[PDB]
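Worked example (supplementary).
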Amino acid sequence: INYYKDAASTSSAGQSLSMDPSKFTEPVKDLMLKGAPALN
Amino acid sequence: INYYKDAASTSSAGQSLSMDPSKFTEPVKDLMLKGAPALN
Amino acid sequence: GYSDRVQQITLGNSTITTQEAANAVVCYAEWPEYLPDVDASDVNKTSKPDTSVCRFYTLDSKTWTTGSKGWCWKLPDALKDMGVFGQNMFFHSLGRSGYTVHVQCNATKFHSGCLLVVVIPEHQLASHEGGNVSVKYTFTHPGERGIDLSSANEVGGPVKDVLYNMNGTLLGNLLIFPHQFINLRTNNTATIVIPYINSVPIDSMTRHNNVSLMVIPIAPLTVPTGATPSLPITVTIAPMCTEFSGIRSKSIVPQ
Amino acid sequence: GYSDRVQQITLGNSTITTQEAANAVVCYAEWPEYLPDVDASDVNKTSKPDTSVCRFYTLDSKTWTTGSKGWCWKLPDALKDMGVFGQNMFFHSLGRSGYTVHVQCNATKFHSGCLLVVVIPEHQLASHEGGNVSVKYTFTHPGERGIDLSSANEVGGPVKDVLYNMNGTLLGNLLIFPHQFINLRTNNTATIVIPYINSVPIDSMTRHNNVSLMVIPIAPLTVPTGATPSLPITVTIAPMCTEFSGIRSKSIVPQ
Amino acid sequence: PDTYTSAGFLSCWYQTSLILPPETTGQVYLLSFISACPDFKLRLMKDTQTISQTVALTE
Amino acid sequence: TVASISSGPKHTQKVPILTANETGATMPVLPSDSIETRTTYMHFNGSETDVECFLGRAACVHVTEIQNKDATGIDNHREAKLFNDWKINLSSLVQLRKKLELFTYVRFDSEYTILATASQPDSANYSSNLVVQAMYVPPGAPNPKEWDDYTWQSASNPSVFFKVGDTSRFSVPYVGLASAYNCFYDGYSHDDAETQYGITVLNHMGGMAFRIVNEHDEHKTLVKIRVYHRAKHVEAWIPRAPRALPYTSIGRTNYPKNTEPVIKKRKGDIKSY
Amino acid sequence: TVASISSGPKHTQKVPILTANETGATMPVLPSDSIETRTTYMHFNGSETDVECFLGR
Amino acid sequence: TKDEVNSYLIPLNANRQNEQVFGTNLFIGDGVFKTTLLGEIVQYYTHWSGSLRFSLMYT
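After joint prediction of all chains, the assembly is encoded as:
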């Protein structure tokens, strides 16, 4: 129950439960498959 | 009504109403019947 | 014609027969079983030597005399040197096991005496010094010799006072632990099956013992007239469902 | 992009990667497998330590120099002291095993040299004395050290003459045995998978070795100018599908 | 770092040995990285020993 | 539910009262196996003997004290009780300890209540109003060195601010590293020849640091902190023999030497009533 | 959720542990690519590492 | 003795056989690990569990 009118006044947000490290761990242009050779 | 998000914050648990003394009072391998001889 | 009385336990390449048993206890009514995945944490596949480790090792014999106070062995310590069980033990980082314990003591229908055979999960001993003196490692790792409660206090060792279970509790209440009596007039062996009991799924076999087996004379031994005043007590123990994990170099432990 | 050239072998808790392989040989086109019942004789259930014995042990390294004649290891001897494999070995009456052998030697594109890596089933050695002099036990059980074909004749030892394979046959014909070459210009490792080969279903691991692994320089090592004139050769070997049976007291063997 | 809770050791040795081509010399180096597997769990947040201060900063 | 059924005379070959205790069992014998009984009902459920109930009331687990005074020229705040820490335990005051050690492994959430009262033992014009800060300091966090260190910023570490005279209350989930807390541990942290025996991290519940936020007034004020702990959501395994001798140390089983007989001696015979 | 799957011996031409870090990627290698593993579950969600939680006290 | 780009470099010697390249314990919250991003984040939490990935790039 929100007792207040504005959105800033609500409690903390709830877990992204998004999670996708590939923008950080695999930003390569041509896709690399694990097990296939790195450099062909 | 829980007012809080986490489970630790809820009140005391409610009675097991489990109760089974046999693990402590009769841990024998071959079942003993009351009234039958203890050692055959 | 089956009696509670006669029994055979075959485990590995070794068999025990008793013709004067008094049933057998299975701690907490649970039988040893391997470690389920749902309970697993370490990702390593474990090693299950099976029949080469799950057989019966008979420790060296003790001598019950009228002055005996009782003896105490720790597991897996007592077996730290038995065959391949022991090797596996020093060579893996983690291991887990249940046991069948069979304590033997026969006499005649003229003797009297009664031993308590009890298994205590997590038996943390007390220092006889009091205060917060610790009990050094070696002292709680007697190996197959076990601890002799009628031996003298030593320094860095535990207290050996029987009315207090080596920890500040009374002998009389040890009966809350899985146990069985050997009453010469009834019984000649005691058998207890121990499931693996711990707060972690698998642990180190050398830094932590998870049960102490204790044999304590309670009704003093009384032999017939002009009999030799003593009887030997033998302890045979078999690891069961043993699993080892995290193999490597081979632990080096104090002393 | 798979090449015959790059490979990974993971066995137990150990992995090997080679980026310059030349395929791998599987002796007689058969892969190690356990002992089927139809072939069994001993009635004992066997023990299969699995991952604690089926991992890769790297023996101590050798040094190929321009004067090297070749080295010879026997199996299971070479592993008689590796971890739990070895313990199991001394503790059971009978055991059986296949192996993955990986011989390693890297150099540069200016070196030349070519080693023959061969596995000989039942390699009965000859006495250098001639006649019917025997080759004493110790001499055919060098352990991880193996036999160094450029060492001197010793008394009670085998002959170490390379053009004769240590038995009266010519080096040139060793190619009838499963083998692979390491030619610095091509190759940097050799891998051979050995199935268990015997005339009995299971045997003693201490009185009989069932293969000798032999590494022999054939085209002499030639290093680039002002290079150090030698390369190390390393042998890593992993028991696979090992089974032990007839556990007991623990063999005591000469020397 | 805690004992009971300790995790092991990591070592690295020559398996055969490094060999340099002709006309080349000296030491070569390895770079080493560390990251966590997708396996990883971290819990019970607290303050880092890696940063402290003695007076409030100002502009 | 019947507490006793009706039972009459017996002349059988079936004797439920003869057993063999050597077996380790306690055979479930009832009044009606050996006397003639009448029906009676239980009228009772055993509600208040549930382990949740037994361990579920607040017990005092710790009393500490800090003071508000001029820190000018104090070389060791910790030592002047300018602030104070406490590594959480349930085995320092014995009442709750004996209760928990009836079990080997125990698992529960904790609810803490902290009461703080002030004392002014020497001449003050008044009673000041102080705010206490209690910081939860998990192992590895910087520990306070002065009563007003950067540590107290507590940007990542839970802290509660309440007034002396009031009470603070919050609840912490089960923070054990294993599946349960070990009430006992017959082990070491490693196979060392001299490492401590019995005391283990398996029991570790964090640690807490207290201080007054207020600067000093002209008089000095003693604030004494009492921490209460209530187990909620309790789970207990493997019952053990109750503690008979007195305790000597946090975390060891050790009892004092030349202790006194714990079993009351009869004033009379075995035959005495 | 599985934290580790069961995996056994390997003798392949497909080597997931050899990579080229010069590319800028961190290849997602797991215990089961290089030792033999057993199944285990995560039992965990990563709740307390959410940025809302990290900056939210 | 002072932070330098050089403490990121593990040196290798040509022609050594059998010998050891480096050693370290695995207290990820201390020692070598401590300044790495992994080490640096681990330090915001009290407990960790999971697998680590250690890689070496040859130069």
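Two points are worth noting when inspecting this output. Chain G touches chain H at residues 19, 21-22, 26, 29-31, 48-49, 54 (CB under 8 Å). The first strand of chain G starts at residue 2 and ends at 4.
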